[PDB]
Design a protein around this ligand. Structure first.
Ligand SMILES: OC(C(F)(F)F)C(F)(F)F
Ligand SMILES: OC(C(F)(F)F)C(F)(F)F
Ligand SMILES: OC(C(F)(F)F)C(F)(F)F
Ligand SMILES: OC(C(F)(F)F)C(F)(F)F
Lengths: 6, 6, 6, 6
């Protein structure tokens, strides 16, 4: 899986 | 501001 | 600002 | 198998 942000 | 995770 | 995975 | 992003 991959994820992120802000 | 404050944030993060993963 | 964050990101991750694999 | 491949994955990525951000
Ligand atoms: O979630 C992984 C990714 F990101 F697609 F490569 C997996 F390989 F496990 F599918
Ligand atoms: O965003 C800051 C926080 F996180 F609320 F402390 C500020 F105080 F500057 F609003
Ligand atoms: O992305 C960060 C967060 F999470 F919003 F605090 C930044 F401080 F950089 F805005
Ligand atoms: O996921 C691989 C791919 F990319 F299809 F070749 C596997 F060899 F494992 F199928």
């Amino acid at each position: 899986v991959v994820g992120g942000x802000x």
